[PDB]
Design a protein around this nucleic acid. Sequence first.
DNA 1: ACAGGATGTATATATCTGACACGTGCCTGGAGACTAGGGAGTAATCCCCTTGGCGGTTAAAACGCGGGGGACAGCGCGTACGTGCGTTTAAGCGGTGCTAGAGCTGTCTACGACCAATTGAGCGGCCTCGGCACCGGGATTCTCCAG
DNA 2: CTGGAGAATCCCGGTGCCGAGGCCGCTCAATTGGTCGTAGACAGCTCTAGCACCGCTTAAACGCACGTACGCGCTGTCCCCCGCGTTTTAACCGCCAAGGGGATTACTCCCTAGTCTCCAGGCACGTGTCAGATATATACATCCTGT
Lengths: 97, 98, 79, 80, 94, 94, 109, 109
Amino acid sequence: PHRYRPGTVALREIRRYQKSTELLIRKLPFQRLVREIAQDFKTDLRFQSSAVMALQEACEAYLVGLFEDTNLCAIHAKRVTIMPKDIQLARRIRGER
Amino acid sequence: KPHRYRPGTVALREIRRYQKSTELLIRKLPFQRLVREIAQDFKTDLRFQSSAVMALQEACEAYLVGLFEDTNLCAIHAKRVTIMPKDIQLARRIRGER
Amino acid sequence: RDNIQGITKPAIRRLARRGGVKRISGLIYEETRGVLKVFLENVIRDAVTYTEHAKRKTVTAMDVVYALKRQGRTLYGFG
Amino acid sequence: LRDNIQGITKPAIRRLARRGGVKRISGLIYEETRGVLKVFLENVIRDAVTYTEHAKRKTVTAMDVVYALKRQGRTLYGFG
Amino acid sequence: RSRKESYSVYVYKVLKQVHPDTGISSKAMGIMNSFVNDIFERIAGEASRLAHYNKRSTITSREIQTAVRLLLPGELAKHAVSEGTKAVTKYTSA
Amino acid sequence: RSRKESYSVYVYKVLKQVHPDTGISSKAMGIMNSFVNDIFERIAGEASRLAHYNKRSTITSREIQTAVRLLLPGELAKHAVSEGTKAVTKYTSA
Amino acid sequence: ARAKAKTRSSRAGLQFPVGRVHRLLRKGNYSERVGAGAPVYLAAVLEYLTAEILELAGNAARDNKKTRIIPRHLQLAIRNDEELNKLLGRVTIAQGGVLPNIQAVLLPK
Amino acid sequence: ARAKAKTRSSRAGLQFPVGRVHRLLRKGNYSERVGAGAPVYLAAVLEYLTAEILELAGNAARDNKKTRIIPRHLQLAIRNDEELNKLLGRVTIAQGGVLPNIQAVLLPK
DNA sequence: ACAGGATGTATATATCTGACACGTGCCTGGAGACTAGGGAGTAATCCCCTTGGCGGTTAAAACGCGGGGGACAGCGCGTACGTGCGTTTAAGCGGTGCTAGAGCTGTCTACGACCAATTGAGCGGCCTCGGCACCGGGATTCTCCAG
DNA sequence: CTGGAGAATCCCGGTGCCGAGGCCGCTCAATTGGTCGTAGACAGCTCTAGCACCGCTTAAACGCACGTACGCGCTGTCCCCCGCGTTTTAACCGCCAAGGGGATTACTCCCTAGTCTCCAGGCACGTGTCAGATATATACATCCTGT
């Protein structure tokens, strides 16, 4: 049968999701996370629909900005694979940890 | 017999030496000629207070010592102990300066 | 609980694709959803203390936007 | 004034690197640190002179430096 | 039925002087409203400190020249001062 | 011969209630003056926005409880509100 | 019977309002009093910066063969220009996406 | 013949001034008007944070066997406490130095 | 290097929907003209502080010679992550309904700006003596070569 | 690995010098005691939109497998950096001295707040059509085995 060698579907997905503007986390399991991170500050809080979509445009902008920084840490160590050494380095240099 | 410490050991005792003090590590007169050389690109015949040059003094070593902390962890992450000028360029791009 | 698991392995993997990531080690998917929830615990606890100050019970869209701006993460498109 | 960036000598960059815990230093680190620091001084003095001539005085005061560092997000205590 | 203000009238006039056969979305107009509000409070926030540092009580155009030179980078500050002094010069002549 | 204000009188009173046999330098007092001025303008700067966001014109103690809870981290904000409400409670009783 | 009312934005030849910006300065708690040339100066700086973005965002829309500027074209306009990228380096634009760059180590050869 | 003047800092039992903080709020361009409990609340928060640092800086001075707090002891007080380090994480203290830490890879074994 | 096949991907045409662009009517925020009080611009003066210069001391910088530890290229071995297929799994839609809380209006009351006359807290200057900085000296710790 | 050698930091103790601390005028900013108007509290009411539900479709997550390319360890070689001695340079010090410009105090005038009145610019609301999203089928470009 036909078979792509490993590294060619991964590059067309980098080309795919850098062309779009969609939200990459599903909508409903992200609303259920927000509603339980906010339940230990006040009980029975309510949310606008544009207040949860404001949190998701910010969390995906934070993580995509983190994975650009964590990719330059793996290239710097002569790898191409990300591993959580690289995340923990990029968190430290930006003053987050 | 001529006595020599191994390469590395007086490097550690003057990491301990300057992390214990507060002295200004750049010599003061060549730094003051540098500030006045850079400042001529914006206005001619400027004057400086003595404490305005010493405020630029204190700010620049704090920027560099904080940068040499960040560039050291970029070199240990790449599995070496020598900082190379590709490590400064990584530390200055993750923070958002370049 | 069990809601942090809803940010799935292919959802993190395609956020990594927008950042340019070629291949992912398997111990990242429990790493980033720990990084994500630390981020939301800082934005929401400033969002919901804007609702208490305004004596509201709902979290408006401006309360997320004002909470993000004071973390240096300003957002355009919601007010 | 001219050729003052080499007043920041090779043992002065080394003593700055060892307050930051650096054990071994490559020889090409010195020409970049002359350039990294010169970029940083060209941004603080550029703002500090802007605060002086707004107030119409020929002397760059210490408060002009403290204000110019504060608007870059590097607040300095000890000068006012 | 409250009346709320935006800059969407004025952004759409500047767009028709630059690209007269180009439109804009609603979501892209809400971003251009967020842009103008943000740059307003940066410049008015910095000019508020320049007047306070020199113990003045008036924000003039000279506290806004300096706040433009502090905030806007490089050549983008150089054209914005040229666009600013020209509007004040035309205003005092009329 | 102008008279310039600092917090050096008040820092030296708090030091003698915490460490009554300990002094301070002049350079360390100029840092504690820079600390109090900085934390003042963070809290008064955040309370200025809380009053503006809710379309109020008064900064009360309730806009300073919220600005303390926003700015000070963790347990350091929890003792500072306890120290704040107790001073307002003692003030209204006297 | 006085005169026809001329806007202050037409005395300076501007499109952004001078009278609204003058009110927002005087009611925004910035100073005790506001000069008369201060909203004229500020409404011209705000008009230049929107004219700078809408020129670049209008170019990115015709390169994608569209006649309406969506927030993708505002993202591409700002992150490609080097001066607007530094003015707006800490700013997230909603529904803007990123710019396509693959690191050259990852490309196969 | 009215009454002896009592300071507002003594009505609340504080050492930081309430009357000075009330003036700096009302002349600092923060709002149109300032509540009466607002400088009382703010001068108590400022007094707690200086009492928190001078307690930790006084401990670092007796650990170095000195009786005067120099700016080294203020640096050691802030960067060792975890809550003051995050409040003051973007702040340079002049003549403060750093904290001694060598990375464990660099130590010889 | 090279040709064919196969699987994604750009090009082009057709159609529908709904969101932009526009028009219209009303309201309230901006502009007109005016008045008066204080902010700030201008002038004069004073003296702090900044620049410039000079000579003696010596610390720190520059140079240079060994040589050894570490960077770095190369290799091989074995996990582990990518690709793909089949099978569950709930997300997404849309439709319906309920109502909690946002938002608005219209009271009035307590709170804060404002004023003025009064006084004590805080500030600048002026001294004194003790913390502490440094120099001399002997002792403890610690690195490293040979055993 | 197991001890003497030698270098460096350490703890001690004594002598001088100055910066902290505590003092004393005196000026001015905080205080006290009233008064006046409006900001914000509280009540009532509207109706938006947030939460909850069920059902059906199917896109997307899940699980399993296979094999390949990557991470990682080991090894070896060269050369670059570190430690140290010698010589050179200029930072550092203290002192001398002119004068530029910061930091005041007066004085006046003109610019901005404030006010009343008039009115058009810009907001909300409809309303229809064209940009564009979606489908469907191409040619085209690209990866990959076998060559």
